[PDB]
């Protein structure tokens, strides 16, 4: 592949990974298609990254969060529940292991599986609490694409965390299971169950 010899030896695998920007030098961002047209602009796949660890100022403007790499948004959502706050390096490592596990179990690009999981778990309708001087009812309302992506990621990471709590299975495994089940649209997934519950409750309060 034309290996370049420098005074400091660089491993060939790293030199190969210089020509094409792959996630963790393993997984291509090419061929990663978002099946839902409405989420294309809200799921960032088109700028590839070597690791899910940018120091990007995505919070400073309303929709700049859409332009954050989707895997980084997933990483950031793992590092919650107090004791895990700020531990981004651990979260990135969990994601590496999760993607390795997904690859082995599906033989598909694990980035695609993550995208498919997010598209499938995003609730289309939700209920809002509307009240008119004392009494409050639920009103059915449509959900914005950015909210769909946000809820999808939240449901996946909460489900995976609860499944890993006081269980022998690691967070990497439970997250991989949750993502694979969500990508297949399986009613075993916490995220799918909760999406369908919300949409059913919305339909009932229409």
């Amino acid at each position: 592949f034309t290996p370049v010899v420098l005074a400091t030896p660089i491993p060939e695998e790293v030199q190969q990974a210089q020509t094409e920007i792959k996630l963790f030098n393993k997984w291509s961002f090419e061929e990663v298609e978002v099946k839902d047209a409405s989420l294309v602009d809200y799921v960032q796949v088109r700028q590839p990254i070597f690791v899910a660890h940018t120091a990007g100022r995505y919070a400073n403007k309303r929709f700049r969060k859409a332009q954050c790499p989707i895997i980084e948004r997933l990483t950031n959502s793992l590092m919650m529940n107090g004791r895990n706050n700020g531990k981004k390096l651990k979260a990135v490592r969990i994601i590496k292991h999760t993607l390795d596990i997904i690859n082995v179990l599906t033989d598909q690009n694990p980035i695609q599986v993550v995208v498919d999981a997010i598209t499938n778990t995003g609730p289309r309708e939700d209920t809002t609490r509307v009240g008119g001087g004392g009494a409050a009812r639920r009103q059915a309302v449509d959900v914005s694409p950015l909210r769909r992506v946000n809820q999808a990621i939240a449901l996946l990471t909460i489900g995976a965390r609860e499944a890993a709590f006081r269980n022998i299975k690691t967070i990497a495994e439970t997250l991989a299971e949750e993502l694979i089940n969500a990508a297949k649209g399986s009613s075993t997934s916490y995220a799918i169950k909760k999406k369908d519950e919300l949409e059913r409750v919305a339909k009932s309060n229409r």
Binding site: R93, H97, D100, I101, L105, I168, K169, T170, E173
Partner: protein, 70 residues
């Protein structure tokens, strides 16, 4: 779930038969499917790796991920 504390011949023979069939092999997979100890499971994986029955994908101190040798 019940979990093994001593190795045991019948469990040893099962490890050798079943672990090559599994597409994904990790400490948890052994514990769930083979009612084995978590730390018997780590010893078993190191043995099966030495015999070349399973291939390591990723070795981390907290998580070891193996595949079947195709």
């Amino acid at each position: 779930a019940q979990h093994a504390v001593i190795l045991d011949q019948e469990k040893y023979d099962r490890i050798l038969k079943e672990v090559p069939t599994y597409r994904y092999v990790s400490v948890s997979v052994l514990v769930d499917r083979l009612k084995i100890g978590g730390s018997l499971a780590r010893i078993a994986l190191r043995h099966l790796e030495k015999e070349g029955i399973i291939k390591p994908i990723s070795k981390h101190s907290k998580q070891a991920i193996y595949t079947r040798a195709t």
